[PDB]
Design an enzyme around this catalytic site. Sequence first.
Site, mmCIF file in Angstrom:
data_model
loop_
_atom_site.group_PDB
_atom_site.id
_atom_site.type_symbol
_atom_site.label_atom_id
_atom_site.label_comp_id
_atom_site.label_asym_id
_atom_site.label_seq_id
_atom_site.Cartn_x
_atom_site.Cartn_y
_atom_site.Cartn_z
ATOM 1 N N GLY A 65 2.644 -7.506 -3.696
ATOM 2 C CA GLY A 65 2.313 -6.148 -4.121
ATOM 3 C C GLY A 65 3.427 -5.125 -3.958
ATOM 4 O O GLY A 65 4.253 -5.229 -3.048
ATOM 5 N N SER A 66 3.446 -4.172 -4.896
ATOM 6 C CA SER A 66 4.236 -2.945 -4.839
ATOM 7 C C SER A 66 3.240 -1.803 -4.679
ATOM 8 O O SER A 66 2.030 -2.038 -4.636
ATOM 9 C CB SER A 66 5.029 -2.748 -6.136
ATOM 10 N N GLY A 87 2.934 2.796 -3.338
ATOM 11 C CA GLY A 87 3.537 3.968 -2.707
ATOM 12 C C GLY A 87 2.907 4.273 -1.355
ATOM 13 O O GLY A 87 1.686 4.449 -1.281
ATOM 14 N N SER A 88 3.685 4.276 -0.268
ATOM 15 C CA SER A 88 5.031 3.688 -0.206
ATOM 16 C C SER A 88 4.885 2.293 0.419
ATOM 17 O O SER A 88 5.519 1.984 1.437
ATOM 18 C CB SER A 88 5.968 4.575 0.626
ATOM 19 N N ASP A 137 -13.415 5.685 -7.792
ATOM 20 C CA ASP A 137 -12.349 5.145 -8.665
ATOM 21 C C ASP A 137 -12.471 3.608 -8.720
ATOM 22 O O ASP A 137 -11.478 2.893 -8.611
ATOM 23 C CB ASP A 137 -10.977 5.581 -8.087
ATOM 24 C CG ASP A 137 -9.809 5.481 -9.092
ATOM 25 O OD1 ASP A 137 -9.942 5.913 -10.281
ATOM 26 O OD2 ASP A 137 -8.731 4.997 -8.652
#
Length: 256
Positions: free
Chosen positions: A18-19, A21-22, A133
Amino acid sequence: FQSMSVKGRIYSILKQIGSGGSSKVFQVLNEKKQIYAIKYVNLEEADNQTLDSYRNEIAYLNKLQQHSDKIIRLYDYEITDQYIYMVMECGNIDLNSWLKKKKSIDPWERKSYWKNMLEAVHTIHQHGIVHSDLKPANFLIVDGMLKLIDFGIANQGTVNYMPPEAIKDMSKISPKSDVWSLGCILYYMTYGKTPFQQIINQISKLHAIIDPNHEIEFPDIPEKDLQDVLKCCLKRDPKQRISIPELLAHPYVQIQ
């Protein structure tokens, strides 16, 4: 290629999953070669409101552990002023990737995943959390079981799951907002698209979502119980919309 220490225990990194923020998520092995996911969050830029939303979500995750196994396991964490490490259950694949890859879905598998989604969201609602969401990516397949990975506290199509009352709010958001979104997820698992995927112009899509003259289509399918569920979830007026406790007593999830 590298080590990480979390609360004195050393974990080898297999790969990055995973990527974010942050944040980075890593697939890792402990010293006994048991597989985990470690979420790393850099806190060097985070302001105090952000910091508090991170702490708040960790705390609920940690607590909701013991109430349902349809919430991802958090085994341990290390939090400093510089970073968070969270040692968690490792997933096979998220529901959104699984749905894109799967041609058709087994009705049994679909009903099982729906039950799991309902149990996870019910749980967070019992502790006063409206996600607000929900999308397929919030769910992970672990051990043939769907688990909720995120509560919508920290992170704060994609517009396709948005409920009409959120759009008309532009206070109106209640537990029923999550029923709309879940309904859209089940609609996708049933008819291979979200209810308004057709509408490409976004100003138009949004108007469709709030327009009661825009009838959502429910094509005839062999499971009449499933049709009824979709129809009850996709009611624009949230007071007319079915609740989670009601959805748990529904024949679709109770009978087969």
